[PDB]
Amino acid sequence: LTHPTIVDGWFREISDTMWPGQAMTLRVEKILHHEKSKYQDVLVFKSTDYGNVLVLDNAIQVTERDEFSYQEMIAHLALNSHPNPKKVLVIGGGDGGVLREIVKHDSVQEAWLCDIDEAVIRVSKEYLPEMAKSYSHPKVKTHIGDGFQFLRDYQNTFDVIITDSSDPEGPAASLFQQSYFELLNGALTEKGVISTQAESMWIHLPIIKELKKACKEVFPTVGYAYTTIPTYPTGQIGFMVCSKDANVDVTKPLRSISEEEEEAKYRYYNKKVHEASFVLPTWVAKELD
Amino acid sequence: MSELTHPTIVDGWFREISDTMWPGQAMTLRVEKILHHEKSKYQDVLVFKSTDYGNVLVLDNAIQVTERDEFSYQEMIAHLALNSHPNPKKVLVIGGGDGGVLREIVKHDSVQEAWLCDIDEAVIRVSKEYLPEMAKSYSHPKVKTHIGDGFQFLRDYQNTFDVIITDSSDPEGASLFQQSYFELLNGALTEKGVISTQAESMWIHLPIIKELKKACKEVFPTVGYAYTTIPTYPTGQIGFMVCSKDANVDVTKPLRSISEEEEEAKYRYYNKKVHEASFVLPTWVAKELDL
């Protein structure tokens, strides 16, 4: 097989808008799958050093080697900021990774996925088995469809909502951030928590500042956290973590487990990392104050 | 060929490649113009203007600094060490040819002398021309430079330095970070002396970090591993060993600090909270480094 992103045995992800003037490249052992779904270009290749790689519309989504950092941080930052999460939703979690993290929490009764593209779920089951094993968990429920319409049908339903979806970055996304957070707010229960993929503070601090402002218009409790991902450009990405409960501090874990069971359950997240992930470099902290 | 050319730059992009040290991945930077290329007695020296990260210094095909993001490394390697000493007056940097670490060192009032020892005059000369916001430190009155190999320098200055920072063009790397290198540093330090050394990224070289930590613990009673994020380095980060000869200091929490207002005036990455956070490691790393 061939793919435009793969030349002379190396995958390259480039974006003049997302990451101006820098790229990430990964050595390709073999292309495993390429299809055009009803929604997007779907590429899977086996990399030589990071396991299988899922690429959607030419942007890396996960590699098997380092996916756990993102999945764990976006999920457990939010779940451990709710006193007793019973119904949880991930929007855009087709690869199964966030669902895998959700069902680690015993209190959870239902782990919902809302994703638009069945093709992503199908290829993740075949090529990302350590992520998509979550689909065999009894608590997992999958809705195929538009996330925005699901949220209207399920007002005051979810204790935690996780948006596992690239932060749109144009002037259109900028103006509609607040509208999207208000949509999430309506689907949350009274102390509901959200975590949303944001941006890397090294390259898009102005977008993060905008996201923080939009979040504060909707939620009384707003924080920005980040995690490191060696295959993502700049090497990290951030998350907005917000709660409808004015009384919670999302920057210190409301709930935690013993260090022994953290070591059995998590490879990146723990109660100390939870706090450290909101500790930002001086120039970022000052700009977001 | 009237235009400058370099094997690391293909079709207008610099590629950060090493089949040995980060196999199968390469960060790349778009090049505006190649500015300088020479071969010194010791290494290949390349400078280019990137389109989005300013000027870039590359040594033996490995990126060293870009003007846009160099402050993360320089601040963290310097201030993690300096703020772990109660009153550092004489400081040494080994291999800090770009001048960035010196620039951070001289921000501390207590420092009276900031020595640099580098083998390669070429790096200093090129840095003064192409990295002005780093090499401005060379004109600071506290700064003294010695051109030469750091072993003979350290052997000649025992019980002399309160802090020694090792900033080589690669984390060794010429991986002379055996226990004997740390013993040599131990002797050049004063009785509560502190070292910081470039280590490895925990995403790709955790077994080397564990070995480095064991070797440091053979020499120093107080040893910690911290990291910082660098958007143009492989994996986007690198770690540091921070050690003290004083068993009664905790390097993982800042012994000394300045007010938050002064921090915002002087530092762009480091601060007293980041100091503590930089030793908080992801679970798989922390578990392995406590083993």
Residue numbers in the entry:
A (entry chain B): 4 to 292
B (entry chain A): 1 to 173, 176 to 293
Give excerpts from the publication.
Spermidine is a polyamine molecule that performs various cellular functions, such as DNA and RNA stabilization, autophagy modulation, and eIF5A formation, and is generated from putrescine by aminopropyltransferase spermidine synthase (SpdS). During synthesis, the aminopropyl moiety is donated from decarboxylated S-adenosylmethionine to form putrescine, with 5′-deoxy-5′-methylthioadenosine being produced as a byproduct. Spermidine synthase (SpdS; EC 2.5.1.16) is a major type of aminopropyltransferase that converts putrescine into spermidine. In addition, SpdS contains a structural feature known as the gate-keeping loop, which is located in the vicinity of the entrance to the active site.
Here, we determined the crystal structure of an apo-form of SpdS from Kluyveromyces lactis (KlSpdS) at 1.9 Å resolution. KlSpdS exists as a dimer in the asymmetric unit, and each monomer in the dimeric KlSpdS is positioned with two-fold symmetry. Each KlSpdS monomer consists of three domains: an N-terminal domain (residues 4–66), a central catalytic core domain (residues 67–250), and a C-terminal domain (residues 251–292). Meanwhile, the catalytic core domain contains seven β-strands that form a Rossmann-like fold from β7 to β13 and seven α-helices. The electrostatic surface representation of KlSpdS revealed a large cavity in the catalytic core domain between the N- and C-terminal domains; the cavity was highly negatively charged, suggesting that positively charged dcSAM bind to putrescine in this active site pocket. While the gate-keeping loop of H. sapiens SpdS (HsSpdS) sterically hindered the entrance of the active site, that of KlSpdS had an open conformation. In KlSpdS, the α6 helix kinked outward by approximately 41.0° compared to HsSpdS and by approximately 34.6° compared to A. thaliana SpdS (AtSpdS). The catalytic residues Asp98, Asp167, and Asp 170 of KlSpdS were highly conserved in other SpdS structures. Although Asp98 and Asp167 had conformations similar to the other structures, conformation of Asp170 was distinct, possibly due to changes caused by ligand binding. Here, we found that the first structure of fungal KlSpdS, which was determined at 1.9 Å resolution, exhibited highly similar to that of HsSpdS, suggesting that KlSpdS is phylogenetically closer to HsSpdS than SpdS from E. coli and could therefore utilize a sequential mechanism rather than a ping-pong mechanism.
